């Protein structure tokens, strides 16, 4: 019956697994998530690099730093972190 209405995001955000990129759980609290984020901000930080590093490490570092900077863009706020949970699927069923 009633089918066809704008709303669902165009695979823009709330699609990539963030709880995995940061190494946290989908049932954790900010205080927890943040802790994982911070610790994952100095491990791939550009300023915290070595001039004796190859080209591979560098490029790879970015890929990570980026994902980490995103996993927080959603799990950092109170609205996004909330809307996300609802969006993502949950083992709660039966």
Swiss-Prot record:
UniProt-annotated location(s): Cytoplasm, Cytoskeleton
Major subcellular site: cytoplasm
Key words of the record: Cytoplasm, Cytoskeleton, Electron transport, Iron, Metal-binding, Transport, Zinc
GO CC aspect terms: actin cytoskeleton; cytoplasm
Segments forming domain J: 17-88
Main function: The iron-bound form is redox-active and can function as electron carrier. Stimulates the ATPase activity of several Hsp70-type chaperones. This ability is enhanced by iron-binding. Plays a role in the diphthamide biosynthesis, a post-translational modification of histidine which occurs in translation elongation factor 2 (EEF2).
Quaternary structure, from the entry: Monomer and homooligomer. Iron binding promotes oligomerization.
Domain notes: The DPH-type metal-binding (MB) domain can bind either zinc or iron ions.
Record protein name field: DnaJ homolog subfamily C member 24
């Amino acid at each position: 019956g009633s089918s066809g209405s704008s709303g669902m995001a165009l695979e823009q955000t709330l699609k990539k697994d963030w709880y995995s990129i940061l190494g946290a759980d989908p049932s954790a609290n900010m205080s927890d998530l943040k802790q994982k984020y911070q610790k994952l901000i100095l491990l791939y930080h550009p300023d915290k690099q070595s001039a004796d590093v190859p080209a591979g490490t560098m490029e790879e570092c970015m890929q990570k730093f980026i994902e980490i900077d995103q996993a927080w863009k959603i799990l950092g706020n109170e609205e996004t972190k909330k809307k996300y949970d609802l969006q993502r699927s949950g083992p709660s069923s039966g």
